[PDB]
């Protein structure tokens, strides 16, 4: 027997954030957006450069080890299945004349991945957004691969 609770149950959560039988933990927040500046990801593996990925095209990008649902399968078994989410967010700013503006900004966020995401080789806080700036480097868990982020004029 079980007493009737007032607590939750994944039902709605499951159906609403489910895909292909592999429920995704993360949702795009309303400021999902696509950029004007065309962002490119330059992969490297111990000074060996790998072909660039053009990731200006979607608002969200899933990185992990599960090739099915992930945008980018980072094949290091030290990578959890659903690992990190690249995300464009339209974040407000102040124009130098004081008038308020917003730019599509690229932000990476980790889903409590196992072994840690390294931003310029610092492990970042999970379930939290971190902006990516020009030339910056990324490393997930202890993978032997590293990445540098640029865009067209960068």
Partner 1 sequence: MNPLTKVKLINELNEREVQLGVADKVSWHSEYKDSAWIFLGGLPYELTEGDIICVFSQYGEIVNINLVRDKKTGKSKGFCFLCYEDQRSTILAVDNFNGIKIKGRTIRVDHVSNYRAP
Partner 2 sequence: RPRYSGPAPPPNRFNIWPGYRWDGVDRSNGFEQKRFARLASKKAVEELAYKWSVE
Partner 3 sequence: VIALGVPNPRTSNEVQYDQRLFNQSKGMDSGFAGGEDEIYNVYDQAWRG
Residues contributing to the site for partner 2 (CB under 8 A): 12, 16, 30
Q: Are 41 and 58 in contact (CB under 8 A)?
A: no
Is 12 a binder of partner 3 (CB under 8 A)?
A: yes
**Angstrom distance (rounded) from CA 15 to CA 104:** 29
Is 111 a binder of partner 3 (CB under 8 A)?
A: yes
H or E segment to which residue 69 belongs: none
The site partner of 31 among partner 2, partner 1, partner 3, none (C-beta below 5 to 8 Å per kind) is partner 3
**Angstrom distance (rounded) from CA 150 to CA 35:** 13
Q: Which of 28, 53, 114, 116 binds partner 3 (CB under 8 A)?
A: 28
Q: Are 35 and 56 in contact (CB under 8 A)?
A: yes
Q: Between residues 128 and 135, which has the closer beta carbon with respect to partner 3?
A: 128
Is 125 a binder of partner 3 (CB under 8 A)?
A: yes
The site partner of 17 among partner 2, partner 1, partner 3, none (C-beta below 5 to 8 Å per kind) is partner 3
CA dihedral 124, 139, 134, 100 (to 10 degrees): -30
- Candidate ranges 61-69, 93-101, 127-135, 142-150; the one touching partner 3 (CB under 8 A): 127-135
């Amino acid at each position: 027997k079980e007493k009737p609770s007032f607590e939750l149950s994944g039902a709605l959560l499951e159906d609403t954030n489910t895909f292909r039988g592999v429920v995704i933990k993360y949702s795009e927040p309303p400021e999902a957006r696509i950029p004007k500046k065309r962002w490119r990801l330059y992969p490297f593996k111990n000074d060996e450069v790998l072909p660039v990925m053009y990731i200006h095209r979607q608002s969200a990008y899933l990185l992990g080890r599960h090739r099915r649902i992930a945008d980018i399968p980072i094949d290091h078994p030290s990578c959890s299945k659903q690992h990190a989410v690249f995300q464009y967010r339209l974040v407000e700013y102040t124009r130098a004349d004081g008038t308020v503006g917003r730019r599509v900004k690229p932000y990476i966020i980790d889903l409590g991945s196992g072994n840690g995401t390294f931003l310029n080789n610092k492990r970042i806080e999970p379930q939290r957004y971190y902006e990516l700036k020009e030339k910056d480097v990324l490393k997930f868990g202890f993978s032997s691969r590293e990445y540098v982020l640029l865009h067209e004029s960068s």
